[PDB]
Structure formats: C-alpha cells, structure tokens
C-alpha cells in the first residue's frame, strides 16, 4: 500500500517536524526517523512509559473510556502520540 | 472478562490473524490507520493554528470584507480547471471539487478531489477518470452517492464508502449516453423510485437516470429545440 | 442489549455479591476457607459507609485464630506493594467495583 | 485564560471525526452469473437420446 506508508512519509516531509517514530506494544522501534540516534533511542524507551502511565490516568476516572490521542506541549517542542493496542505512533513538532 | 463469560452473547470478534509477514510492512494497517490519519491532521493543526483560530471566530454599516484563508491545490494537477464544486449534505466540513479541462482544443484526464476542512495539505479521497470531469454533485439523503459528468457525455456514479474507488455505475452507448459533454448534473431529492440522477448535455437532452442492480435506465425528460439545424 | 447496554455504573449496581480472583500463590483448599471468611467479614462491618479500618480489624483477628499468629491483611481502592512472604501463605482477590484485598502470612 | 485558549482551539473542528465511519457500501451492483456445477451424459448409445 502507498496508504499508511505514504501518509507517514508525508508527515515526515512536512515542515517543522523533527521525526515520526513507531513504537511496538513491547517498547520496541518498528520505524524511527529522527536526526541523532540518542534522541530516537531515548524517545523509544521513555515516551511509551508516559503513554501507559497517562492511559492509567484516563482509565481510573472512567474504565470504559480508553486513550485515543495524547498531546503534551513543552517550552520549545510539542510531543504528540496516537496510541493503539498493536502499535503507537509518536511525533515531535516544534511550536510555530 | 468474567461478565462476558457469564453473558456468551455476541462474542468479541476482531480475531488475532493481524497482518504478520515478519518483515517488509508488518500490520501498518485498520486501527493503526486511524491513529496515522489523526496524527497527520493534528500535526497540520499546530502549524495552521494561527489560520484555524482566525477561521472559527475572527468575526471578519453598508460595507463587506472577504478574507481568503486556505488554498487546496496539487503541482501535477495545475493544468486542469476547477469547474464544478459541491458540499456533502450530511458533513459541512467535507466538500468535493471536480478538476476538468475547459477551452475544448486542449483535453486531458480529470481527477475528482474530496478535500476535508480537517486536512488542507492533500485530498481525503482521489478519483482518476478517463476525461475531464465537468459536473459533480452529492445526493441530499445519502452523501456517499456522488454524481459525476465528464466529456463524451459519460455519466459516472461513485460511493465514498467503497475502498476500491472504481465507478459503481457507468453510462454506455447501449444505455443511450448523450454525445459531446455533460455541463451540469444534479440528484433528485425524491427516493420513492430508487435514486433519480438528472443530467444535461451540450447535445441538448435533459436525461433522468435511475439506479438499478448492474444496469442504468435512461429516460429523456425534455428536448431543448426556428430556422436553424439540430437541437439547441 | 447485553454487554453494550451494560455501563460501569450499571455493572457495579447490577451485581455487588460477585467474586473475582487475580493471583493465588496459596494452596487450593486453604483459599476456600479464607474467601468465605473475608466476604462474610467485610459485608458485616461494611456499615452505612465502608470503614476500611473496621473491615481489616475483623479479618486480622479471624485469620490469627484460624491459622497462624503473624497474619497481615490490607484492603484498598488502589495501591502498589512488594511484600516478602513464606511459600503458599498469600492470596490476592479483589471484591467487585473499587475494593482490592491482599491477605498473606509473614 | 491559558486553558480558555486551549478549549477554543479544540472547539474549531472535531479533528477525530471519520467521514462515513462504520456504514458500508450498502447498494452494490451484483452481475447475474450461472455456474455450471456438473454435466450428466449417456456413454456409447446407438444414436443420441434426447
């Protein structure tokens, strides 16, 4: 298919995006498209724990209602994560 | 889990066959597609936030002011003209533009683009056709039904729901297709006699098309028609 | 209807006397004894509003007389623990809704 | 005033809405086929028998 593998190529090519990284449910790197490897390795380990911890937050308040999309916003950067059961998509977009 | 065991009524589907294949595109397919699509839009949203904050409530005595916000285009598709545009009657965000060729002497293929206000970068749906698409329309009741008219007066019908993206229906010479082009095409709001699709050609015959199972039934409504030659 | 009609606030209200076991390091026969005592114990001293101290006063004393002298039992809505225990001395069963019961013998 | 700012942005568009989510093709053209399963026939008869 062109459709997932093209959209993922499109959001990378898109201006003011550092890189898109797919995390496996077992905290593993399927695709990692950042500049420096330290950042990509760091993002691969650190962020999927925040999303699991942030999933337990929304879950406690209402255990029917599951996480569909998490967006953190830092001083310099934004961090946006779209979690699913099979895979999790992560991006880092610099604020305009 | 114990409640589902207690009450086995409508057992949970989505069986774990997945995609698999080890390497070279593993899954990357249907729950994950949603997450990819949502991510794209939300990445755009952050870069266009300045324009999106304006779009909703900028709020722009006998004076008017018009503000252009976004332009949706494609560099491959700069040759073709916009011709007809239409909005989906169900969804006020999703609109469809139908790119075709004017000026007669120059004639190329036409691609129908369904741009969502959600994602302004590229279309939500593409549809390659044989000639330039002149007229496009949406059926007021079911917005999936898409009415298409293009050169050689061929009448096309599409469903947005269908994934394959080929035409659901087509008009042929055996189904009495009008010659030359089809400038305008509209849906009949009435759904008592299946689905009535209306078309006009430059040949000058107002044609009523009815949707049937693997066939299109044409009916000549009126003829346009003086010391001249042919039909008006 | 069935699972779709059932919401969390309906599921909890529909059924209070349900029972669900997560872990079970203790032997098959000794669980049957304890499970009956803790369920009957909590419901007794549930009172108008659930006294979590009162529940674990009753369970502590019962499980001291029944088995061994140094038996430790804690209940709660939600918590994290690591607890060194003897072999086949530990049961973890949560009651319906928002009640997590850890019982062990130190 | 910092949260009011974030409410406004999300209220502009739903952004998670899927156009024609769930509902299938519905009416789809089905061509009328006739699959010949099996032929019967007589073997080495004097002339043919209708």
Give the helix tally of chain B.
Answer: 3
**Biggest β-sheet of chain B, characterized?**
4 strands, antiparallel
User: Which structural class fits the helix and strand makeup of chain B?
Assistant: alpha+beta
- CA radius of gyration of chain D is 33 Å
Rg of chain B is 23 Å
In one word, what is the shape of chain D?
rod-shaped
Strand order of the largest sheet of chain B: 1-2-3-4
From the spread of the alpha carbons, the general shape of chain B counts as globular
PDB class: structural protein
Keywords: axonemal dynein, microtubule doublet, structural protein
Entry title: Structure of outer-arm dyneins bound to microtubule with microtubule binding state 1(MTBS-1)
Chain A: Dynein light chain roadblock
Features of the shown structure:
part of a larger assembly; 4 chains; A: 96 residues; alpha+beta; five-stranded antiparallel β-sheet; 2 helices; 5 strands; globular; D: 50 residues; mainly alpha; 1 helix; 20% helix; cytoplasm (chain A); transport (chain A); dynein intermediate chain binding (chain A); Roadblock/LAMTOR2_dom (chain A)
Kindly describe this structure.
This is part of a larger assembly, with chains A (96 residues), B (232 residues), C (106 residues) and D (50 residues). Chain A is an alpha+beta fold. Helices cover 36% and strands 31% of the residues of chain A. Chain A contains 2 helices and 5 strands, in the order H-E-E-H-E-E-E. Chain A is globular and about 40 Å long. The termini of chain A are far apart. Helices cover 13% and strands 26% of the residues of chain B. Chain B is built from 3 helices and 12 strands; from the N terminus they run αααββββββββββββ. In chain B, strand 6 and strand 7 form a beta hairpin. The longest helix of chain D is centred in the first third of the chain and has 10 residues, at 2-11. With 50 residues, chain D is mostly helical. Chains A and B meet through helix 1, strand 4 and strand 5 of A and helix 2 of B. Chain C: One of its GO terms (molecular function) is dynein intermediate chain binding. Chain C: This is Dynein light chain. Chain C: It is found in: Cytoplasm, Cytoskeleton, Cilium axoneme. Chain C: Force generating protein of respiratory cilia. Produces force towards the minus ends of microtubules. Dynein has ATPase activity.
């Amino acid at each position: 298919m062109s459709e997932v593998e093209d959209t993922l190529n499109r959001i990378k090519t898109h201006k003011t995006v550092l890189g898109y990284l797919i995390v496996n449910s077992e905290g593993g790197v399927v695709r990692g498209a950042f500049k420096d490897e330290e950042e990509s390795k760091n993002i691969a380990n650190s962020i999927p724990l925040l999303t699991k911890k942030a999933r337990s937050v929304v879950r406690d308040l209402d255990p029917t209602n599951d996480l569909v999309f998490l967006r953190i916003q830092t001083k310099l950067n934004e961090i946006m994560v779209a979690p699913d059961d099979e895979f999790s998509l992560i991006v880092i977009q610099t604020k305009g | 889990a114990e409640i589902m065991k207690d009450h086995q009524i409508e057992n949970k589907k989505k069986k774990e066959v997945d995609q698999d294949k080890k390497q070279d595109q593993s899954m990357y397919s249907t729950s994950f597609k949603r997450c990819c699509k949502i991510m794209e839009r939300m990445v755009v949203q952050n870069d266009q936030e300045d324009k999106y904050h304006d779009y909703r409530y900028y709020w722009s005595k006998n004076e008017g002011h018009l503000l252009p916000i976004w332009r949706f285009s494609n560099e491959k598709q700069r040759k073709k003209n916009v011709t007809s545009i239409c909005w989906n009657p169900l969804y006020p965000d999703l609109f469809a533009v139908s790119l075709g060729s004017y000026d007669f002497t120059k004639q190329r293929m036409g691609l129908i683009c369904l741009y969502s206000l959600k994602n302004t970068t590229h279309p939500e749906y593409a549809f390659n056709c044989e000639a330039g698409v002149m007229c496009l329309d949406f059926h007021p009741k079911s917005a999936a039904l898409l009415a298409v008219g293009l050169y050689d007066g061929t009448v096309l019908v599409y469903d947005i729901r269908n994934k394959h993206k080929k035409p659901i229906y087509q008009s042929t010479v055996r189904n009495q297709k009008h010659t030359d082009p089809v400038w305008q095409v509209k849906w009949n709001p009435d759904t008592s006699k299946n689905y009535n699709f209306y078309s006009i050609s430059s040949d000058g015959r107002v044609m009523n098309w009815i949707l049937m199972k693997n066939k299109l039934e044409p009916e000549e409504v009126i003829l346009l028609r003086s010391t001249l030659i042919g039909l008006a | 209807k069935a699972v779709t009609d059932m919401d969390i606030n309906e599921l909890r209200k529909l059924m209070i006397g349900k029972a669900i076991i997560n872990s079970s390091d203790m032997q098959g026969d000794l669980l049957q004894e304890a499970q009956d005592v803790i369920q009957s114990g909590i419901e007794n001293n549930s009172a108008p509003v659930l006294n979590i101290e009162a529940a674990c006063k009753y369970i502590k004393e019962n499980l001291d007389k029944k088995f061994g002298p140094t038996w430790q039992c804690i209940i709660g809505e939600g918590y994290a623990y690591d607890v060194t225990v003897q072999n086949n001395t530990l049961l973890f069963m949560f009651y319906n809704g928002n009640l997590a019961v850890l019982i062990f013998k130190s | 005033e910092g949260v009011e700012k974030c409410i406004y942005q999300n209220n502009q568009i739903d952004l998670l809405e899927e156009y024609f989510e769930g509902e299938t093709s519905e009416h789809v053209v089905e061509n009328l086929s006739s699959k010949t399963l099996m032929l019967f026939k007589d073997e080495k008869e004097i002339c043919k028998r209708s």
